[PDB]
UniProtKB/Swiss-Prot annotation:
Forms homodimers. Forms homooligomers. Autophosphorylated. Residues 52-103 form the PAC domain. This is Sensor protein kinase WalK. Residues 1-69 form the PAS domain. It is found in: Cell membrane. The lineage of its organism: Bacteria, Bacillati, Bacillota, Bacilli, Bacillales. Zn(2+) binds at residues 9, 12, 98, 102. Member of the two-component regulatory system WalK/WalR that regulates genes involved in cell wall metabolism, virulence regulation, biofilm production, oxidative stress resistance and antibiotic resistance via direct or indirect regulation of autolysins. Functions as a sensor protein kinase which is autophosphorylated at a histidine residue in the dimerization domain and transfers its phosphate group to the conserved aspartic acid residue in the regulatory domain of WalR. Overexpression of walK/walR reduces susceptibility against vancomycin. The chain holds residues 70 to 176 of 415 of the full protein. It comes from Staphylococcus aureus.
């Protein structure tokens, strides 16, 4: 439920969305990796921002477990997850961007 055991690091880009997959939180690291200003990110579709709209749909996130390599210069491993409330209802989505040269 509320506890997502998705693996995350201090240096990770993090993006969080609403139910429509529109970005509502993005940290400094994610902006850095994307090479984009917060103003061009907040409120835009996460999958558009990640250049995935051709490849991936929001519907797939829940039943998906696969992480993907993405060119953002930087090669990131992206892992998507759902944000789920107490009653099992999905409230939004998370992308975790791991720099491939991490650790
Ligand atoms: Zn990481």
């Amino acid at each position: 439920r509320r506890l997502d055991s998705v693996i995350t690091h201090m240096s990770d880009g993090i993006i969080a969305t609403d139910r429509r997959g529109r970005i509502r939180i993005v940290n400094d690291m994610a902006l850095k990796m994307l090479g984009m200003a917060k103003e061009d990110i907040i409120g835009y579709y996460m999958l558009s921002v990640l250049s995935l709209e051709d490849e991936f749909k929001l519907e797939e996130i829940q039943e998906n477990n696969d992480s993907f390599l993405l060119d953002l210069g930087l090669i990131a491993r992206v892992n998507f997850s759902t944000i789920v409330q107490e009653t099992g209802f999905v409230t939004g989505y998370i992308a975790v961007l791991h720099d491939v040269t991490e650790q």
